[PDB]
Amino acid sequence: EVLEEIHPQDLLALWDELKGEHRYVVLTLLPKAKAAEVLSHLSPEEQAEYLKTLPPWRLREILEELSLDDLADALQAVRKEDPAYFQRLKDLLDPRTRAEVEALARYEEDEAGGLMTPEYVAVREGMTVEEVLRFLRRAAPDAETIYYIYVVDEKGRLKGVLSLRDLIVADPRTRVAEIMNPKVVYVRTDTDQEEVARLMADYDFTVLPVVDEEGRLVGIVTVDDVLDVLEAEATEDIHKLGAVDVPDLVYSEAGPVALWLARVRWLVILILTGMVTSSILQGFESVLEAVTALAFYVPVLLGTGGNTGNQSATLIIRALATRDLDLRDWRRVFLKEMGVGLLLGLTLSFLLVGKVYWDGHPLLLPVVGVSLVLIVFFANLVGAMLPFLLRRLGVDPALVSNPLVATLSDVTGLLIYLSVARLLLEA
Amino acid sequence: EVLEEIHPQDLLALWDELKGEHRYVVLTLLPKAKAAEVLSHLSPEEQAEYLKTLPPWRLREILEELSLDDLADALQAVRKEDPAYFQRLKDLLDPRTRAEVEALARYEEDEAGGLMTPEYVAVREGMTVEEVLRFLRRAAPDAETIYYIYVVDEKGRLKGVLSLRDLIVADPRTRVAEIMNPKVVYVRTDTDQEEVARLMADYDFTVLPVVDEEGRLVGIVTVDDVLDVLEAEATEDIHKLGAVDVPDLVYSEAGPVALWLARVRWLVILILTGMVTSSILQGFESVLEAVTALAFYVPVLLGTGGNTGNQSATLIIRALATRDLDLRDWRRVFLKEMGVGLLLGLTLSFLLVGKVYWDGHPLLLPVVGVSLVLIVFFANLVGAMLPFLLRRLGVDPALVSNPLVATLSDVTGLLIYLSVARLLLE
Ligand SMILES: Nc1ncnc2c1ncn2[C@@H]1O[C@H](COP(=O)(O)OP(=O)(O)OP(=O)(O)O)[C@@H](O)[C@H]1O
Ligand SMILES: Nc1ncnc2c1ncn2[C@@H]1O[C@H](COP(=O)(O)OP(=O)(O)OP(=O)(O)O)[C@@H](O)[C@H]1O
Ligand SMILES: [Mg+2]
Ligand SMILES: [Mg+2]
Ligand SMILES: [Mg+2]
Ligand SMILES: [Mg+2]
Ligand SMILES: [Mg+2]
Ligand SMILES: [Mg+2]
Ligand SMILES: [Mg+2]
Ligand SMILES: [Mg+2]
Ligand SMILES: [Mg+2]
Ligand SMILES: [Mg+2]
Ligand SMILES: [Mg+2]
Ligand SMILES: [Mg+2]
Ligand SMILES: [Mg+2]
Please check whether residue B249 lies inside any domain of the structure.
no
Sequence-ordered alpha helix ranges (H) in B283-401: 285-290, 292-296, 298-321, 330-358, 366-391
Please check whether residue B248 lies inside any domain of the structure.
no
CATH number of the domain at B115, please.
3.10.580.10
Which of A235, A277, A288 faces B318 most closely, judged by CB atoms?
A: A235
Q: Are A151 and A159 in contact (CB under 8 A)?
A: yes
CATH number of the domain at B301, please.
1.10.357.20
B112 and B92 assigned to the same domain? no
Please check whether residue B275 lies inside any domain of the structure.
yes
A400 and A279 assigned to the same domain? yes
Segment (H or E) for A46 = helix A44-53
Nearest one of B320, B302, B293, B334 to B408, comparing CA atoms: B302
Nearest one of A194, A408, A173 to A322, comparing CA atoms: A194
How far apart are alpha carbons A172 and B307 in whole angstroms? Answer: 66
B51 and B28 assigned to the same domain? yes
Q: What is the per-residue DSSP string for A241-301?
A: HTT---SS--STT--HHHHHHHHHHHHHHHHHHHHHHHHHHHHTHHHHHH-SGGGGGHHHH
B157 and B78 assigned to the same domain? no
Residue of A178, A179, A181 best suited for mutating to test ligand 1, as the one with most atoms within 8 Å of CB = A181
How many CB atoms are closer than 10 A to CB A193? 22
A74 and A59 assigned to the same domain? yes
Q: How many distinct structural domains can be found in chain A? A: 3
Q: How distant is the Cα of B343 from the closest Cα of chain A, in angstroms?
A: 7
Tell the burial category of B50 from Cβ atoms under 10 Å away from its Cβ (0-12, 13-18, 19+). buried
Q: How far is CA A251 from CA B137, B198, B319, B389, in A?
A: 50, 20, 7, 18
Q: Are B378 and B412 in contact (CB under 8 A)?
A: yes
How far apart are alpha carbons A69 and A77 in whole angstroms? Answer: 13
How far apart are alpha carbons B123 and B131 in whole angstroms? Answer: 9
CA pseudo-torsion sign B156, B158, B160, B161: positive
A77 and A128 assigned to the same domain? no
Q: Are B350 and B376 in contact (CB under 8 A)?
A: no
Length of chain B, in residues: 426
How far apart are alpha carbons B89 and B104 in whole angstroms? Answer: 16
Enumerate the residues of chain A whose CB falls inside 8 A of the CB of residue B202.
Answer: 9, 12, 41
CATH number of the domain at B12, please.
1.25.60.10
In angstroms, this model's resolution equals 3.6
B239 touches chain A (CB under 8 A): yes
**Does B109 carry a binding-site annotation?**
no
Percent helix / strand / coil, chain B, rounded to 5: 70, 10, 25
CA pseudo-torsion sign A218, A223, A226, A228: negative
* Residue B114 falls in which region: left (phi positive, over 0), alpha (psi -120 to 50) or beta: alpha
B236 and B353 assigned to the same domain? no
B67 and B139 assigned to the same domain? no
Which of A107, A132, A151 corresponds to the end of one domain?
A107
Amino acid (1-letter code) at residue B32: K
How many CB atoms are closer than 10 A to CB B224? 17
How far apart are alpha carbons A69 and A76 in whole angstroms? Answer: 11
Interface test with A, best of B135, B166, B237, B300 (most A CBs within 10 A): B300
How far apart are alpha carbons A275 and A282 in whole angstroms? Answer: 11
How far apart are alpha carbons B350 and B380 in whole angstroms? Answer: 18
Q: Are B68 and B100 in contact (CB under 8 A)?
A: yes
Which of A242, A264, A287 corresponds to the end of one domain?
A242
Q: How far is CA A16 from CA A256, B201, B326, B388, in A?
A: 21, 18, 10, 19
Length of chain A, in residues: 427
Nearest one of B186, B414, B131, B402 to B295, comparing CA atoms: B414
Which of A84, A107, A130 corresponds to the end of one domain?
A107
Please check whether residue B190 lies inside any domain of the structure.
yes
Percent helix / strand / coil, chain A, rounded to 5: 65, 5, 25
Enumerate the residues of chain B whose CB falls inside 8 A of the CB of residue A275.
Answer: 300, 352, 355
Segment (H or E) for B132 = helix B129-139
B15 and B126 assigned to the same domain? no
Residue of A163, A167, A184, A222 best suited for mutating to test ligand 1, as the one with most atoms within 8 Å of CB = A163
Where in the sequence is the domain holding B47, given as residue range(s)? 1-107
**A163 pocket-lining for ligand 1 (C-beta < 6 Å):** yes
**A165 pocket-lining for ligand 1 (C-beta < 6 Å):** yes
How far apart are alpha carbons A401 and B229 in whole angstroms? Answer: 25
Which of B136, B339, B410 faces A256 most closely, judged by CB atoms?
A: B339
Dihedrals phi, psi of A185, to nearest 5 degrees = -90, 130
B157 and B204 assigned to the same domain? yes
Q: How far is CA B59 from CA B63, B99, B101, in A?
A: 6, 18, 16
Please check whether residue B327 lies inside any domain of the structure.
yes
CA pseudo-torsion sign B300, B306, B308, B314: negative
**Does A228 carry a binding-site annotation?**
yes
Residue A140's beta-bridge partner residues? Answer: none
E strands of B68-203, at which residues? 120-122, 145-152, 158-163, 187-188
Tell the burial category of B142 from Cβ atoms under 10 Å away from its Cβ (0-12, 13-18, 19+). exposed
Q: How far is CA A64 from CA A36, A173, B99, B126, B294, in A?
A: 9, 38, 51, 37, 68
A283 and A386 assigned to the same domain? yes
Please check whether residue A377 lies inside any domain of the structure.
yes
Please check whether residue B362 lies inside any domain of the structure.
yes
How many CB atoms are closer than 10 A to CB A138? 10
Reduce the secondary structure of B41-106 to three states and give it as a string.
CCCHHHHHHHHHHCCHHHHHHHHHCCCHHHHHHHHHHHHHHCHHHHHHHHHHCCHHHHHHHHHHHC
How many CB atoms are closer than 10 A to CB A381? 18
Method of determination? X-ray
B235 and B189 assigned to the same domain? yes
Nearest one of A311, A287, A232 to A421, comparing CA atoms: A287
Q: Are A201 and B231 in contact (CB under 8 A)?
A: yes
A207-208 and B207-211 strand pairing: unpaired
B74 Cβ partners below 8 Å, 6+ apart? B39, B40, B44, B47, B48, B51, B66
Please check whether residue A263 lies inside any domain of the structure.
yes
**Does A192 carry a binding-site annotation?**
no
Q: How far is CA B219 from CA A342, B115, B211, B259, in A?
A: 49, 9, 7, 36
A148-152 sheet: strands from edge to edge: A122-124, A148-152, A158-163
Q: Are B325 and B316 in contact (CB under 8 A)?
A: yes
